[PDB]
């Protein structure tokens, strides 16, 4: 039944690609994205969660994110109520190899937690660094309100969870002691890239 | 026919739970919630009320809330036009036993009127107090813009009506004399919990 | 086909009324409203007009409102481009006999143009006055940002077009010379009701 | 299948026109618009692009707009990342011969890039000028926050891409060096029309 709803949606994407005469390799790339992102199933997730209440939604995001939470010290060792407030504002995103998730110099308005995948952190000239499952990136712009200090490129398929600057700020107003945890990491990174 | 629309919606929830591999007890808890919240029937309530006008919507909320109004002195003894302005901005919510409706220390942005159910008011150390049909809670944060002064936990299934801080403020701009009614109760409660 | 879409929508309203156990006279009142408001036909008007462009939407509202425009000196004698800017922001509303469209003392945020119907203007004590096809009301609050100076009650079924304070202000920023036309009428009315 | 979705949508437009008793020539004009705008096919484009990610959406708009980009020096010779930020915020619009896309004296909040078509630029008295594929108009109001300095009328069917003032400002905050490119053209035009 879910296999069916994904099928009808994907048919519309196919029609969109056909109308716009997208090339063959591009259509395959979009197909592969859809299979990785939705895994052959689709539901009106916003309508469903909207029909619930706060406690149920909170129990669901905690259950779904058990591995993300336990695998990242920032979350694992934090007040579970801070963790819940973060989890409720995360957006699942999938990226493909070679995607520029972040471009250096742009104005950043979201950060990313890596559930699964490897990314390259690229700066003018300081040797590529890598981040994987359990790490996060894009926090510096959220803290500074300035420009991205590096590009971040997917090496693999990446399952990420994003957090918008407005949501990051709302949570940190509620849990101001957690602001320093991010600030400490941002400062260490700014030092390491010397800029 | 309504029995039918609830059935199709609930099938989607079942599919969501299946995809996310939620445990058996959790799936039952979500089923029980849905039966209590929607009572086997569903309609596009927002579309319906949207097709009406102000007078009809006002007549409907007044009719539906006759018992809530008559059972709560704040409403029963107030200008019926204030009562209508409140009723039009209430959101029906259902909570299950053990749910933390409010957590102490968090930043509150809504209050609750109890149509039916019992809740426990819990503070660091002052002996649990109980609130039931005809009472309300969560007003203090709405008045102070500060942090919740207690946790409130459902003891029973609870049928509540919530009111957002923005809506509470809009109504009280129109009916500023009613602001003191809430302030008096908030002050009495802050005294009783000594903090 | 439109007769069909209205039928399916109205069935949902019937189900809503049944679920909430609304009284017989109330259900009839809602039926009569629906027949007067939609005249047995329904379409997704917002989706349709959304698919068009500015020029087509403007040509449509002008065509539909030819009688409203020609029957009201404020519009008939104005810059047709001001008239178009007003017409595009009007919302069709239907009221039934006895409805309080406006209540004295409330904070007003919309005004009304009467396409067809009769209303009574009611103030503490100054003798009921009547307004009909070609007139408008609710402008004073829009101009003053204060409280309604009278109640306005439908005597008949009324076909009205409303204009929100924000839309009224946006149009009058573009066409500031038209602000005085409304101000002159508001002042004359404030004089007549002496308050 | 897309031919089918356009057919069902157009039937609703036909029903809307019938209900409002629009004249024959007007109904034909709306039919011709729909054929030019949608070319007999329709999909939920917002839902589709919403299911993708940033990189895919960016690859799609770049592919679809290759000719617009290569045919306009402002884009062709710019940082491709600026171009992408512009392209992602463009809205496709179709206008018909004689449409007033912009009226002199009004408060402007969007500019237009011409993919295909010819427009006339009309001012009080300075001889009509023409703009075509590869040019843009409506930038001056975006820069000045004042009133339109000319009317712009479609001579032909026009395929345009619009950009809102808020989006224009957001992009130019990110790419402030591109602000001067528009300012230089605006100044040259203000000189030429002497006002
Ligand atoms: O030395 C580093 N080791 C690991 N990560 C790093 C390092 N330097 C930068 N980053 C990440 O790259 C992001 C680019 O966007 P941002 O400026 O908003 O935040 C940055 C950091 O999260
Ligand atoms: O002594 C009390 N008797 C009954 N209720 C109480 C008492 N103390 C607090 N409360 C309620 O608990 C809420 C917690 O959220 P809040 O801070 O926004 O508002 C509080 C009050 O409504
Ligand atoms: O003497 C009057 N003759 C006709 N109309 C009048 C007179 N007095 C008031 N009104 C209308 O009643 C409205 C009540 O809402 P409002 O205060 O926003 O604007 C008022 C006027 O439009
Ligand atoms: O001399 C001119 N040659 C070509 N175009 C011109 C000239 N003068 C004005 N325009 C365009 O007309 C628009 C009217 O709206 P706008 O004031 O926001 O921006 C204007 C310019 O883009």
Short mmCIF file of N, CA and C in Angstrom, two decimals, chain C residues 59-163:
data_model
loop_
_atom_site.label_atom_id
_atom_site.label_comp_id
_atom_site.label_asym_id
_atom_site.label_seq_id
_atom_site.Cartn_x
_atom_site.Cartn_y
_atom_site.Cartn_z
N UNK C 59 -9.00 41.29 -14.85
CA UNK C 59 -10.11 41.38 -15.79
C UNK C 59 -11.34 40.66 -15.25
N UNK C 60 -11.11 39.51 -14.59
CA UNK C 60 -12.18 38.74 -13.95
C UNK C 60 -12.86 39.48 -12.81
N UNK C 61 -12.10 40.08 -11.88
CA UNK C 61 -12.74 40.73 -10.72
C UNK C 61 -13.49 41.97 -11.21
N UNK C 62 -12.94 42.67 -12.20
CA UNK C 62 -13.64 43.84 -12.74
C UNK C 62 -14.96 43.44 -13.38
N UNK C 63 -14.96 42.35 -14.15
CA UNK C 63 -16.17 41.87 -14.80
C UNK C 63 -17.22 41.43 -13.76
N UNK C 64 -16.78 40.70 -12.75
CA UNK C 64 -17.69 40.14 -11.77
C UNK C 64 -18.32 41.26 -10.92
N UNK C 65 -17.59 42.34 -10.73
CA UNK C 65 -17.97 43.45 -9.82
C UNK C 65 -18.47 44.71 -10.53
N UNK C 66 -18.93 44.58 -11.76
CA UNK C 66 -19.38 45.73 -12.57
C UNK C 66 -20.49 46.45 -11.85
N UNK C 67 -21.44 45.71 -11.28
CA UNK C 67 -22.58 46.36 -10.63
C UNK C 67 -22.17 47.00 -9.30
N UNK C 68 -21.35 46.32 -8.50
CA UNK C 68 -20.81 46.90 -7.27
C UNK C 68 -20.09 48.22 -7.53
N UNK C 69 -19.22 48.20 -8.54
CA UNK C 69 -18.46 49.38 -8.92
C UNK C 69 -19.39 50.52 -9.39
N UNK C 70 -20.31 50.23 -10.31
CA UNK C 70 -21.12 51.31 -10.93
C UNK C 70 -22.14 51.89 -9.94
N UNK C 71 -22.49 51.11 -8.93
CA UNK C 71 -23.51 51.46 -7.93
C UNK C 71 -22.95 52.16 -6.69
N UNK C 72 -21.63 52.29 -6.61
CA UNK C 72 -20.97 52.96 -5.48
C UNK C 72 -20.08 54.09 -5.95
N UNK C 73 -20.46 55.36 -5.66
CA UNK C 73 -19.70 56.49 -6.16
C UNK C 73 -18.22 56.47 -5.84
N UNK C 74 -17.86 56.01 -4.65
CA UNK C 74 -16.48 55.91 -4.29
C UNK C 74 -15.68 55.17 -5.37
N UNK C 75 -16.21 54.05 -5.87
CA UNK C 75 -15.56 53.28 -6.93
C UNK C 75 -15.83 53.84 -8.33
N UNK C 76 -17.09 54.12 -8.63
CA UNK C 76 -17.51 54.52 -10.00
C UNK C 76 -16.72 55.72 -10.45
N UNK C 77 -16.52 56.68 -9.54
CA UNK C 77 -15.86 57.94 -9.89
C UNK C 77 -14.36 57.99 -9.66
N UNK C 78 -13.76 56.88 -9.19
CA UNK C 78 -12.33 56.78 -8.88
C UNK C 78 -11.45 56.31 -10.05
N UNK C 79 -10.15 56.44 -9.90
CA UNK C 79 -9.15 55.91 -10.85
C UNK C 79 -9.44 54.40 -10.97
N UNK C 80 -9.81 53.92 -12.18
CA UNK C 80 -10.06 52.50 -12.30
C UNK C 80 -8.94 51.61 -11.79
N UNK C 81 -7.70 52.09 -11.77
CA UNK C 81 -6.59 51.30 -11.23
C UNK C 81 -6.61 51.16 -9.68
N UNK C 82 -7.06 52.21 -9.00
CA UNK C 82 -7.39 52.08 -7.56
C UNK C 82 -8.49 51.05 -7.34
N UNK C 83 -9.55 51.12 -8.17
CA UNK C 83 -10.69 50.24 -8.05
C UNK C 83 -10.21 48.78 -8.22
N UNK C 84 -9.40 48.52 -9.25
CA UNK C 84 -8.85 47.18 -9.44
C UNK C 84 -8.05 46.70 -8.24
N UNK C 85 -7.23 47.58 -7.64
CA UNK C 85 -6.40 47.21 -6.49
C UNK C 85 -7.30 46.85 -5.30
N UNK C 86 -8.40 47.57 -5.13
CA UNK C 86 -9.41 47.21 -4.09
C UNK C 86 -10.11 45.89 -4.41
N UNK C 87 -10.61 45.75 -5.64
CA UNK C 87 -11.37 44.59 -5.99
C UNK C 87 -10.57 43.29 -5.81
N UNK C 88 -9.28 43.33 -6.11
CA UNK C 88 -8.48 42.13 -6.02
C UNK C 88 -8.31 41.66 -4.59
N UNK C 89 -8.58 42.51 -3.60
CA UNK C 89 -8.37 42.15 -2.18
C UNK C 89 -9.69 41.99 -1.41
N UNK C 90 -10.81 42.12 -2.11
CA UNK C 90 -12.15 41.81 -1.52
C UNK C 90 -12.46 40.32 -1.35
N UNK C 91 -13.13 40.00 -0.25
CA UNK C 91 -13.53 38.64 0.06
C UNK C 91 -15.05 38.61 0.16
N UNK C 92 -15.66 37.77 -0.66
CA UNK C 92 -17.08 37.56 -0.64
C UNK C 92 -17.51 36.91 0.67
N UNK C 93 -18.55 37.47 1.27
CA UNK C 93 -19.15 36.95 2.52
C UNK C 93 -20.67 37.04 2.47
N UNK C 94 -21.34 36.04 3.03
CA UNK C 94 -22.79 36.05 3.11
C UNK C 94 -23.17 36.02 4.59
N UNK C 95 -24.14 36.86 4.97
CA UNK C 95 -24.67 36.89 6.31
C UNK C 95 -26.17 36.68 6.29
N UNK C 96 -26.71 36.13 7.38
CA UNK C 96 -28.12 35.86 7.47
C UNK C 96 -28.85 36.83 8.40
N UNK C 97 -30.18 36.97 8.24
CA UNK C 97 -30.90 37.90 9.14
C UNK C 97 -30.60 37.71 10.61
N UNK C 98 -30.35 38.81 11.31
CA UNK C 98 -29.98 38.78 12.72
C UNK C 98 -28.51 38.62 13.07
N UNK C 99 -27.67 38.29 12.10
CA UNK C 99 -26.28 38.15 12.39
C UNK C 99 -25.72 39.51 12.82
N UNK C 100 -24.92 39.50 13.88
CA UNK C 100 -24.10 40.66 14.26
C UNK C 100 -22.79 40.60 13.46
N UNK C 101 -22.77 41.38 12.37
CA UNK C 101 -21.58 41.43 11.51
C UNK C 101 -20.45 42.12 12.27
N UNK C 102 -20.79 43.24 12.92
CA UNK C 102 -19.89 43.98 13.81
C UNK C 102 -20.54 44.20 15.20
N UNK C 103 -19.76 44.00 16.26
CA UNK C 103 -20.22 44.37 17.61
C UNK C 103 -19.49 45.62 18.11
N UNK C 104 -20.27 46.59 18.57
CA UNK C 104 -19.75 47.80 19.24
C UNK C 104 -18.70 47.44 20.29
N UNK C 105 -17.65 48.24 20.38
CA UNK C 105 -16.59 48.03 21.38
C UNK C 105 -15.48 47.07 21.07
N UNK C 106 -15.63 46.25 20.01
CA UNK C 106 -14.64 45.28 19.68
C UNK C 106 -13.54 45.95 18.85
N UNK C 107 -12.44 45.26 18.69
CA UNK C 107 -11.35 45.79 17.91
C UNK C 107 -11.58 45.35 16.46
N UNK C 108 -11.80 46.32 15.58
CA UNK C 108 -12.16 46.03 14.20
C UNK C 108 -10.94 45.86 13.33
N UNK C 109 -10.96 44.87 12.47
CA UNK C 109 -9.91 44.67 11.51
C UNK C 109 -10.40 44.41 10.07
N UNK C 110 -11.65 44.72 9.77
CA UNK C 110 -12.13 44.63 8.38
C UNK C 110 -13.32 45.53 8.18
N UNK C 111 -13.51 45.97 6.93
CA UNK C 111 -14.64 46.75 6.55
C UNK C 111 -15.42 45.96 5.50
N UNK C 112 -16.62 46.44 5.18
CA UNK C 112 -17.60 45.75 4.35
C UNK C 112 -18.23 46.67 3.35
N UNK C 113 -18.26 46.20 2.11
CA UNK C 113 -19.04 46.79 1.05
C UNK C 113 -20.29 45.96 0.78
N UNK C 114 -21.42 46.63 0.74
CA UNK C 114 -22.67 45.93 0.53
C UNK C 114 -22.98 45.77 -0.98
N UNK C 115 -22.89 44.56 -1.49
CA UNK C 115 -23.36 44.28 -2.82
C UNK C 115 -24.90 44.25 -2.83
N UNK C 116 -25.49 43.50 -1.90
CA UNK C 116 -26.94 43.37 -1.82
C UNK C 116 -27.33 42.98 -0.40
N UNK C 117 -28.33 43.66 0.13
CA UNK C 117 -28.84 43.42 1.47
C UNK C 117 -29.06 44.74 2.21
N UNK C 118 -29.65 44.63 3.39
CA UNK C 118 -29.88 45.77 4.27
C UNK C 118 -29.32 45.44 5.63
N UNK C 119 -28.61 46.40 6.23
CA UNK C 119 -28.08 46.25 7.57
C UNK C 119 -28.57 47.37 8.46
N UNK C 120 -28.63 47.10 9.75
CA UNK C 120 -28.93 48.12 10.74
C UNK C 120 -27.68 48.51 11.47
N UNK C 121 -27.46 49.82 11.54
CA UNK C 121 -26.40 50.38 12.36
C UNK C 121 -26.99 50.80 13.72
N UNK C 122 -26.48 50.20 14.79
CA UNK C 122 -27.01 50.33 16.15
C UNK C 122 -25.97 50.91 17.12
N UNK C 123 -26.31 52.03 17.77
CA UNK C 123 -25.42 52.62 18.80
C UNK C 123 -26.21 52.86 20.08
N UNK C 124 -25.55 52.70 21.23
CA UNK C 124 -26.15 52.93 22.56
C UNK C 124 -27.53 53.60 22.51
N UNK C 125 -27.60 54.84 22.02
CA UNK C 125 -28.89 55.50 21.84
C UNK C 125 -28.89 56.66 20.86
N UNK C 126 -29.11 56.36 19.58
CA UNK C 126 -29.22 57.40 18.56
C UNK C 126 -30.18 57.07 17.40
N UNK C 127 -31.06 56.09 17.58
CA UNK C 127 -31.98 55.67 16.51
C UNK C 127 -31.27 54.87 15.40
N UNK C 128 -31.66 53.60 15.24
CA UNK C 128 -31.15 52.74 14.18
C UNK C 128 -31.09 53.46 12.83
N UNK C 129 -29.98 53.30 12.12
CA UNK C 129 -29.87 53.75 10.74
C UNK C 129 -29.66 52.52 9.86
N UNK C 130 -29.95 52.67 8.58
CA UNK C 130 -29.86 51.57 7.63
C UNK C 130 -28.90 51.85 6.49
N UNK C 131 -28.23 50.80 6.03
CA UNK C 131 -27.34 50.88 4.89
C UNK C 131 -27.72 49.75 3.95
N UNK C 132 -27.56 49.99 2.65
CA UNK C 132 -27.97 49.04 1.65
C UNK C 132 -26.99 49.02 0.48
N UNK C 133 -27.39 48.32 -0.59
CA UNK C 133 -26.63 48.14 -1.83
C UNK C 133 -25.98 49.46 -2.17
N UNK C 134 -24.67 49.43 -2.40
CA UNK C 134 -23.91 50.62 -2.77
C UNK C 134 -23.20 51.35 -1.64
N UNK C 135 -23.49 50.97 -0.39
CA UNK C 135 -22.82 51.60 0.76
C UNK C 135 -21.76 50.68 1.37
N UNK C 136 -21.03 51.19 2.35
CA UNK C 136 -20.02 50.45 3.03
C UNK C 136 -20.00 50.86 4.51
N UNK C 137 -19.39 49.99 5.32
CA UNK C 137 -19.30 50.20 6.76
C UNK C 137 -18.11 49.44 7.36
N UNK C 138 -17.73 49.84 8.57
CA UNK C 138 -16.57 49.29 9.24
C UNK C 138 -15.26 50.00 8.96
N UNK C 139 -15.33 51.11 8.22
CA UNK C 139 -14.14 51.92 7.85
C UNK C 139 -13.51 52.68 9.01
N UNK C 140 -14.31 53.07 9.99
CA UNK C 140 -13.81 53.95 11.07
C UNK C 140 -12.69 53.32 11.87
N UNK C 141 -12.90 52.08 12.32
CA UNK C 141 -11.84 51.32 13.00
C UNK C 141 -10.61 51.15 12.14
N UNK C 142 -10.80 51.01 10.83
CA UNK C 142 -9.67 50.84 9.93
C UNK C 142 -8.81 52.11 9.93
N UNK C 143 -9.47 53.25 10.05
CA UNK C 143 -8.83 54.56 10.03
C UNK C 143 -8.23 54.93 11.39
N UNK C 144 -8.93 54.58 12.48
CA UNK C 144 -8.56 55.00 13.85
C UNK C 144 -7.70 54.00 14.61
N UNK C 145 -7.73 52.72 14.24
CA UNK C 145 -7.08 51.64 15.00
C UNK C 145 -7.69 51.48 16.41
N UNK C 146 -8.89 52.01 16.61
CA UNK C 146 -9.60 51.93 17.91
C UNK C 146 -10.72 50.88 17.96
N UNK C 147 -11.81 51.20 18.63
CA UNK C 147 -12.89 50.23 18.83
C UNK C 147 -14.09 50.59 18.00
N UNK C 148 -14.84 49.57 17.60
CA UNK C 148 -16.04 49.78 16.81
C UNK C 148 -16.98 50.76 17.48
N UNK C 149 -17.52 51.70 16.71
CA UNK C 149 -18.37 52.77 17.22
C UNK C 149 -19.85 52.43 17.19
N UNK C 150 -20.19 51.27 16.63
CA UNK C 150 -21.58 50.86 16.52
C UNK C 150 -21.60 49.35 16.29
N UNK C 151 -22.73 48.72 16.53
CA UNK C 151 -22.97 47.36 16.06
C UNK C 151 -23.64 47.47 14.68
N UNK C 152 -23.38 46.48 13.81
CA UNK C 152 -24.03 46.39 12.52
C UNK C 152 -24.62 44.99 12.40
N UNK C 153 -25.94 44.94 12.22
CA UNK C 153 -26.73 43.71 12.21
C UNK C 153 -27.44 43.55 10.87
N UNK C 154 -27.35 42.35 10.32
CA UNK C 154 -28.05 42.04 9.09
C UNK C 154 -29.55 41.98 9.34
N UNK C 155 -30.29 42.70 8.53
CA UNK C 155 -31.76 42.63 8.54
C UNK C 155 -32.22 41.57 7.56
N UNK C 156 -31.52 41.46 6.44
CA UNK C 156 -31.82 40.52 5.36
C UNK C 156 -30.65 39.58 5.15
N UNK C 157 -30.79 38.62 4.24
CA UNK C 157 -29.61 37.95 3.69
C UNK C 157 -28.75 39.06 3.08
N UNK C 158 -27.44 39.01 3.33
CA UNK C 158 -26.53 40.05 2.84
C UNK C 158 -25.40 39.42 2.07
N UNK C 159 -25.14 39.95 0.88
CA UNK C 159 -23.99 39.60 0.09
C UNK C 159 -23.01 40.76 0.24
N UNK C 160 -21.92 40.53 0.95
CA UNK C 160 -20.98 41.57 1.27
C UNK C 160 -19.62 41.23 0.71
N UNK C 161 -18.78 42.26 0.60
CA UNK C 161 -17.38 42.05 0.26
C UNK C 161 -16.54 42.71 1.33
N UNK C 162 -15.70 41.93 2.00
CA UNK C 162 -14.87 42.47 3.03
C UNK C 162 -13.46 42.82 2.58
N UNK C 163 -12.90 43.74 3.34
CA UNK C 163 -11.56 44.24 3.12
C UNK C 163 -10.86 44.35 4.48
#
